CSV table of C-alpha atoms in Angstrom, one decimal:
chain,number,residue,atom,x,y,z
A,1,UNK,CA,92.7,111.5,354.5
A,2,UNK,CA,92.6,109.5,351.1
A,3,UNK,CA,96.3,108.7,351.7
A,4,UNK,CA,95.7,107.8,355.3
A,5,UNK,CA,92.9,105.4,353.9
A,6,UNK,CA,95.4,103.8,351.5
A,7,UNK,CA,97.9,103.6,353.9
A,8,UNK,CA,96.2,100.7,356.5
A,9,UNK,CA,96.8,97.8,354.0
A,10,UNK,CA,99.7,96.6,356.5
A,11,UNK,CA,97.8,96.7,359.5
A,12,UNK,CA,94.9,95.7,357.9
A,13,UNK,CA,96.6,92.9,355.8
A,14,UNK,CA,96.7,90.7,359.7
A,15,UNK,CA,95.5,87.9,356.6
B,1,UNK,CA,80.4,121.9,338.9
B,2,UNK,CA,83.6,120.1,338.2
B,3,UNK,CA,84.8,120.9,341.8
B,4,UNK,CA,82.3,118.2,342.5
B,5,UNK,CA,83.7,116.5,339.2
B,6,UNK,CA,86.8,114.6,340.1
B,7,UNK,CA,85.0,113.3,343.4
B,8,UNK,CA,83.6,110.2,341.0
B,9,UNK,CA,87.1,108.4,341.8
B,10,UNK,CA,87.1,108.7,345.5
B,11,UNK,CA,84.4,105.7,345.7
B,12,UNK,CA,86.5,102.9,344.7
B,13,UNK,CA,90.3,103.6,345.8
B,14,UNK,CA,89.8,102.2,349.9
B,15,UNK,CA,88.3,99.5,348.6
B,16,UNK,CA,90.9,98.3,345.5
B,17,UNK,CA,93.7,99.2,347.9
B,18,UNK,CA,92.5,97.4,350.9
B,19,UNK,CA,90.3,94.9,349.5
B,20,UNK,CA,91.9,91.9,347.3
B,21,UNK,CA,92.2,88.2,348.4
B,22,UNK,CA,93.4,85.7,349.7
């Protein structure tokens, strides 16, 4: 779960 | 327990990994 929570930065980096 | 002695690192990790700047 921690690895998947790290792995969001590409989709959450839409800024 | 040290079972719950490794979870002090959990709090910072995702807001370090996503939270940064612009």
